[PDB]
Design a protein around this ligand. Structure first.
Ligand SMILES: [Cl-]
Ligand SMILES: [Cl-]
Lengths: 141, 141
């Protein structure tokens, strides 16, 4: 009964925010590492494990409710569906999103940012190919 | 020169998507684990390390450009700023976001989802307190 509800939206938003929180806190922990704050770094890493649990619990409800992947709007019920979601998102990123970001970065006078986005387009293409090979393995039984 | 540009927006969007990709792929790897696909699971985990590198590189450009944290719109130049960003986001989540999500979940007839959001409000309150104690440690020199 979750499809089309505000609660469906809120689970998706929760997933986005918890995902960012884990990345942010681990990035902050690396700064603590460099500067010599190991107890702060360790606390950041442990809090980040909390954010993993929160993100994964949001995804559990999203699937239990027949809602789609926050990133791709594809189903993620089965493992094969999960890999198809990965392929769809990767294809978008390597063919469309990162090339477009690189072009705009060049247009706006940020060539180093553009080369980073071009690196990421190539990297996401490789990810897409790896996930396509996974799907072939799963569909072959 | 990045402030107010499309490239600033694109770095922020890139960070969001890479953050979700790492969480998604690790969630998918746990399903592969359970079902008995260890080579798929290991590949998912390795691809997820790629997404960490991509997310962190987006954050590097965001900081090098004097842009704010995608999650909180607070600066993240210094370690103290990073902890202040964590406190701001956590305060929002525990006081405002998760309580509101829980109330809406109850209004819409999803009591189990509501109890999950109430658990997360309490958890984020604890995170906020831990980060406040970190900031006190840093400001005390
Ligand atoms: Cl420390
Ligand atoms: Cl396998």
């Amino acid at each position: 009964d979750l499809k089309g509800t505000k609660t469906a939206e809120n689970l998706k938003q929760g997933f986005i925010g918890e995902s960012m929180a884990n990345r942010r806190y681990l990035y902050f922990a690396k700064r603590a590492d460099e500067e010599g704050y190991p107890e702060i770094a360790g606390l950041l890493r442990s809090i980040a494990e909390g954010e993993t649990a929160h993100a994964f619990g949001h995804l559990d409800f999203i699937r239990q409710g027949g809602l789609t992947d926050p990133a791709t709007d594809k189903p993620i019920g089965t493992l094969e569906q999960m890999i198809e979601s990965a392929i769809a998102g990767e294809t978008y990123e390597w063919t469309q999103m990162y090339p477009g970001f690189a072009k705009v970065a060049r247009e706006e006078g940020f060539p180093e940012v553009a080369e980073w986005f071009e690196t990421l387009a190539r990297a996401e293409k490789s990810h897409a190919e790896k996930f396509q090979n996974v799907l072939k393995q799963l569909k072959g039984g």
